[PDB]
Amino acid sequence: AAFVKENHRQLQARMGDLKGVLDDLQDNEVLTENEKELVEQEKTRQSKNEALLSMVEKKGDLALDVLFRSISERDPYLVSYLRQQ
Amino acid sequence: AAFVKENHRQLQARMGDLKGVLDDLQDNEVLTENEKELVEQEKTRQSKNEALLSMVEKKGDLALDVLFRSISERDPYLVSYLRQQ
Amino acid sequence: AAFVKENHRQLQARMGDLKGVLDDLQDNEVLTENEKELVEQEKTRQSKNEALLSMVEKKGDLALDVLFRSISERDPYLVSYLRQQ
Amino acid sequence: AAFVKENHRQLQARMGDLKGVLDDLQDNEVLTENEKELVEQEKTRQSKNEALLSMVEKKGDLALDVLFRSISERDPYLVSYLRQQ
Amino acid sequence: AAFVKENHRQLQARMGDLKGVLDDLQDNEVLTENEKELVEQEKTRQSKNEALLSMVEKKGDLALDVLFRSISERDPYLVSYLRQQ
Amino acid sequence: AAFVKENHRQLQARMGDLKGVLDDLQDNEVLTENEKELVEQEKTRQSKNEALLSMVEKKGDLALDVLFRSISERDPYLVSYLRQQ
Amino acid sequence: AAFVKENHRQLQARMGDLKGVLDDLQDNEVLTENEKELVEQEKTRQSKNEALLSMVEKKGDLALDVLFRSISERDPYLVSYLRQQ
Amino acid sequence: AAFVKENHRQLQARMGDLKGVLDDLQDNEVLTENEKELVEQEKTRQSKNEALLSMVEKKGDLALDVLFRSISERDPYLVSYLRQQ
Amino acid sequence: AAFVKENHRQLQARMGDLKGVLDDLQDNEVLTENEKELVEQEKTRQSKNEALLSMVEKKGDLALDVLFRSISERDPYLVSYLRQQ
Amino acid sequence: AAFVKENHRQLQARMGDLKGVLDDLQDNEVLTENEKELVEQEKTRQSKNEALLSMVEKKGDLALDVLFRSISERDPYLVSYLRQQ
Amino acid sequence: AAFVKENHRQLQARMGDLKGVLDDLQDNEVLTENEKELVEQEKTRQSKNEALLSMVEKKGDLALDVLFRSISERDPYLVSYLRQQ
Amino acid sequence: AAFVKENHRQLQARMGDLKGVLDDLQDNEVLTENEKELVEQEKTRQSKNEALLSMVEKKGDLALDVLFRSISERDPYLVSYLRQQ
Amino acid sequence: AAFVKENHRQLQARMGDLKGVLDDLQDNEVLTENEKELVEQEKTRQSKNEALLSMVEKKGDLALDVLFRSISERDPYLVSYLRQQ
Amino acid sequence: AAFVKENHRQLQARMGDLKGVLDDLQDNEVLTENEKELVEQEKTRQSKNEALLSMVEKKGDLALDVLFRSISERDPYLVSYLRQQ
Amino acid sequence: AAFVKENHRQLQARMGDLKGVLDDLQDNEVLTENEKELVEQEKTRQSKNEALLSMVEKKGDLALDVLFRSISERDPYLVSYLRQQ
Amino acid sequence: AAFVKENHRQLQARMGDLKGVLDDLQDNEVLTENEKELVEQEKTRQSKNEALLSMVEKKGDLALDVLFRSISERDPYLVSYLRQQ
């Protein structure tokens, strides 16, 4: 959960396909449809990553934990890379 | 209802998409169209949160309760995060 | 692993059939099905190579190593050619 | 090895039965089965020659040398004709 | 022309996009550029409607007629709705 | 016509492709080109639905009837679902 | 009909050729041509499945039933697999 | 049924004539004509094997069992070879 | 001409060799070369039938009549089968 | 020329391959390359038809005549169908 | 130059793609980059046309002539249509 | 410098974007930040032009010359138009 | 606390967004809502800074300390810059 | 740090994508979220550059140094161009 | 380097595939990934050319030289054509 | 070279096998591999002809001459037919 906070910049510059994590967050009620659509209407992938990351940090640490779990299963290689550095 | 008052600053710094809560408040007659439009014409999201929060506290505690319910359903994760701290 | 980074342009201009490496990466959980499909829906082979290479560098160096191994077994002649130059 | 590069057009317009060279390249790990099959599924013999030649130049100069050896043994008359002109 | 006067409140609460009527009034010399700009610098749509309506009633009944014509062509459905009630 | 009013929230959360209804409303003079364009320049589909619905309620009940007819032909399944509940 | 809702994620990750179900839905007026085309212009099969599933849930439960019937006849093995788990 | 899953790569690299298994799957309603045709329009035999295998795993484990039976009767030697290793 | 419309699904699932009807339609100016080529570049025969049928219904009923005549002469047995059922 | 105006909806719902008419309009200076590209970047064929039709009506009646001629030669069957109804 | 003034309303309701004329005006020093950007940040095409037209009339008649030339070359059909009416 | 004085009314009714001239005047110490902000807090563009023009005439003729230079470079077309009349 | 007094002019000419400090002062009962509103209704930012600074010095040194703390957290860079000079 | 001051006008007219520098400044506590949002809500890129530059000069020279570093890494070519002139 | 400036309009109307030059500029640190993505998200090829050209002129003349070199190698025929005219 | 321009439509409707001319253009550096691949990924032969012709006209007249030579040798009969008419 904190790991997201210490890795905000790397997560924006590295996270790729957001459809998986967005759907997982939606199904965990972290994000409503409107919130997800707002995330997706950004022009650039770094912009989309910033939108998603900020929207989730504002939700608190529990939701940050849910996001971290969803990334760790949707993209375990990046999570592991960051966590060991 | 009080919970809003003890969490004014956190609610301004955390609340995100206000369209849901604004529409819910409108449909509960807490806010008229003009009031909602005045809330939305602020430049920044913290400014919008301040406008909405102040406009609702002035209405009394019953309306504060309606606002709290609307947040608890539109953004339950932040509500829960705050309530457990 | 680094060797991929020093040879980004050559690898895009030289790598050929990507089905082998894509399947190997999928089976090593570097890429999910969706990610692989996104790689394959590019129009041109240089575009496909760019998509795959960028998608893998973002994953970190461990995944870059997995990709390098998969190329070194799927197309050893190009790997050797580059590595000796 | 270079000789292939200076004679790309002549080699596409002259090379005939590709089964010998394709099998030799396969046994020298220049081409995998999938790569060979992709070469053979072209409609025309000039198309097949183009596919094979491009697929091999991308592999580097060492593989170009292997291809040249295989042609020089599978079709020495054309190789000699070109080399003396 | 009178119809505007008997429907001041409904016209403020119902009229929508004012660009059409403002341009028509400008081209009929009912409003100068400065007057139109003053109408548009109000914060809310009900405020803009009030500004425009008052600014036009002050001009007299002839200008009220011009405004009514411009609404009846720019937004005939609302005009008809009101006129039959 | 009323049915739209009792189902404002459901219609915003359910209505999908608006091109059909927007074109039908345009051809019934409920909406001018400018009004339609203003509806389409919203970021989100719920935002677009809100814009369209509000813009039409302001026009009166006759225009609400036209909108209801256009939905009942462009998307009869949702209309029927709502009407039986 | 509900079965679709409890199996949203599995249905997106499992459903295959959508031409059959799309045509059946079209012939049952669940989807217009435009809606079907919007479903088909997505890049990936999981994206297409998400588009179709969401577009149908919004239509209500009756249309969800029609979709379920069309899947149960177009792809009975997956339907049965899911229903027994 | 599982045996297919543990032997995905070997089954793609080993399975040969698919007409028998495709017809058997068709007659067991695992595959419709359209699905079978989509399998057959791939360029390469490894591509065809991948298409068929993925299309069947998505159908569930029961259909995987049907596919395994059809292979075990259409090509028992490969099945036995794999199963004893 | 109508008979085509009442038998859209059967005609897609039954029509076979389209070269005859495509050439006849071309010679009756129902289809230009480009249109015919677009019909032929579909992957599957049901896809080709759908493309042709839709492309012709859009042309009107006269062209549907021309198509029906061309089928009735190119494949009279299917036409008769359908017409008597 | 008018015929286009009385048949706007039918022309959007019926017109098919637009490459012919777009090229003809380009060569008659009705459309510049940029305008044609803007027409082609729409997602759906009805969207493309709407874009083209609106872009041409705005140009005046002479350009509408040019468009009608180009359709009458590129797709005479639909033109005739509409004109006789 | 005057022709623009007598056709202000038609030019706002008819002019389409403004990128060409905006770039031409920029290269003729009628508009600076900031002015062009201000024109482009309007929401609607009629709004953009109004902004551009007003911004140019204020510049005088010489600049109106430059704008007219740029339209007459970027969109000659509309210019001709208007000029003959 | 005088030219500003003989063209006070035209300059208020014609000058457009003031950001350029305001910044230039600031950098030439004709206006301090406070003075510039006071100019910008007027409601209307004619009001802003009046404020700026009066504030500069009061400064003397040298500052009027600086303002004229800044307009002649920021908006040469209007300057030329006026100067030749 | 004194530091504010020795830096009155610099603090008026440097302090930027006052919303943070105003809210902090309000929550520390240094300023009532009316006082804050009076601060915000000034035209210019230097005027707003003067109003706030004077209103706080009049309150005494304890309130000056509260204001200094709020600036040091809301805008630490300016505070540090001044304090080291 | 000074280099920013001697190049204020060039930096406003040249700086491009501000997302990088804004995020870097945020992470160096030069700018709070509110300040960054205020910078981004300007209409034009020159306006955004002016807002950012002024907001940073007010912070002092240390923050100007941080901004210069962030530009020198986010856009080294422009920095170098200016510094050598 | 200047040659780009004297040929801005021709370069926007002539430059074709931008992937090569964009990648070369990226590898020469003229453009970051975000900048390149912003260039690619434009709708039209002339729009993309304008975005790239403006983004590079702002960087200075050295970067303009890098861009010119990359075009002269990626598309030498157009460069030569322009340079001799 | 011009002859291509006066015969754009005929050349798109007549040119046949493009492999010869594409390879010749590649070997004359008129087209890079990526450009050639982009030409070949069009669906229809008229589309491919349009892509190639436009891509070459943009390159200038020298490249148009190279293309004309390559056609005159790869397909002399069509060239002669057109040139004598």
Short mmCIF file of C-alpha atoms in Angstrom, two decimals, chain H:
data_model
loop_
_atom_site.label_atom_id
_atom_site.label_comp_id
_atom_site.label_asym_id
_atom_site.label_seq_id
_atom_site.Cartn_x
_atom_site.Cartn_y
_atom_site.Cartn_z
CA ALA H 1 -8.59 -32.87 -19.73
CA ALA H 2 -5.88 -31.28 -17.63
CA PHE H 3 -3.31 -33.23 -19.68
CA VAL H 4 -4.08 -30.82 -22.51
CA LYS H 5 -3.20 -27.89 -20.26
CA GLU H 6 0.07 -29.34 -19.07
CA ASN H 7 0.98 -30.13 -22.69
CA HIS H 8 -0.07 -26.98 -24.54
CA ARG H 9 3.31 -26.29 -26.14
CA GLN H 10 3.99 -29.90 -27.06
CA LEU H 11 0.52 -30.28 -28.50
CA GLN H 12 1.00 -27.24 -30.69
CA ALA H 13 4.39 -28.42 -31.87
CA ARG H 14 3.33 -32.02 -32.47
CA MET H 15 -0.30 -32.23 -33.56
CA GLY H 16 -0.56 -32.87 -37.27
CA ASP H 17 -3.63 -33.37 -39.42
CA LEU H 18 -6.42 -31.43 -37.72
CA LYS H 19 -9.27 -32.44 -40.03
CA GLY H 20 -10.16 -35.45 -37.92
CA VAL H 21 -10.24 -33.65 -34.59
CA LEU H 22 -11.97 -30.63 -36.08
CA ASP H 23 -14.74 -32.79 -37.49
CA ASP H 24 -15.11 -34.71 -34.24
CA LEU H 25 -15.33 -31.47 -32.25
CA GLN H 26 -17.90 -30.14 -34.70
CA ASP H 27 -20.02 -33.26 -34.29
CA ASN H 28 -19.77 -32.90 -30.51
CA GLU H 29 -21.00 -29.28 -30.75
CA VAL H 30 -17.74 -28.03 -29.25
CA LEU H 31 -17.16 -26.04 -32.44
CA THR H 32 -19.58 -24.52 -34.91
CA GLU H 33 -18.80 -24.39 -38.61
CA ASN H 34 -17.69 -20.77 -38.32
CA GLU H 35 -15.33 -21.58 -35.46
CA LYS H 36 -13.82 -24.47 -37.42
CA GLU H 37 -13.34 -22.29 -40.48
CA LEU H 38 -11.63 -19.65 -38.36
CA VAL H 39 -9.25 -22.34 -37.11
CA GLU H 40 -8.47 -23.46 -40.66
CA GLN H 41 -7.76 -20.03 -42.13
CA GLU H 42 -4.49 -19.68 -40.22
CA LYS H 43 -1.35 -19.77 -42.33
CA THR H 44 0.84 -22.23 -40.44
CA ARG H 45 0.25 -25.53 -38.67
CA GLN H 46 1.58 -24.21 -35.37
CA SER H 47 -0.74 -21.24 -35.78
CA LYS H 48 -3.65 -23.59 -36.45
CA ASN H 49 -2.76 -25.66 -33.40
CA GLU H 50 -2.60 -22.54 -31.23
CA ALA H 51 -5.95 -21.32 -32.52
CA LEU H 52 -7.64 -24.65 -31.89
CA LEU H 53 -6.09 -25.18 -28.48
CA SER H 54 -6.94 -21.71 -27.19
CA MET H 55 -10.46 -21.86 -28.62
CA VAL H 56 -10.99 -25.10 -26.76
CA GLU H 57 -9.48 -24.12 -23.39
CA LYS H 58 -11.77 -21.11 -23.34
CA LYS H 59 -14.73 -23.48 -23.66
CA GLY H 60 -13.94 -25.07 -20.29
CA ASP H 61 -12.68 -28.40 -19.05
CA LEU H 62 -15.52 -30.56 -20.37
CA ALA H 63 -14.73 -29.48 -23.93
CA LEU H 64 -11.04 -29.98 -23.21
CA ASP H 65 -11.94 -33.56 -22.31
CA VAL H 66 -13.80 -34.00 -25.59
CA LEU H 67 -10.79 -32.66 -27.47
CA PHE H 68 -8.47 -35.00 -25.59
CA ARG H 69 -10.64 -37.99 -26.43
CA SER H 70 -10.71 -37.01 -30.09
CA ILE H 71 -6.93 -36.71 -30.18
CA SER H 72 -6.48 -39.97 -28.29
CA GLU H 73 -8.44 -41.75 -30.98
CA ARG H 74 -7.25 -39.76 -34.01
CA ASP H 75 -3.56 -39.79 -32.99
CA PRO H 76 -3.04 -42.26 -30.14
CA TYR H 77 0.72 -42.51 -30.53
CA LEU H 78 1.43 -38.87 -29.71
CA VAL H 79 -1.05 -38.93 -26.83
CA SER H 80 0.64 -41.99 -25.37
CA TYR H 81 4.12 -40.55 -25.92
CA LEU H 82 3.27 -37.38 -24.03
CA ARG H 83 1.31 -39.11 -21.28
CA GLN H 84 4.38 -41.20 -20.39
CA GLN H 85 6.80 -38.36 -19.80
#
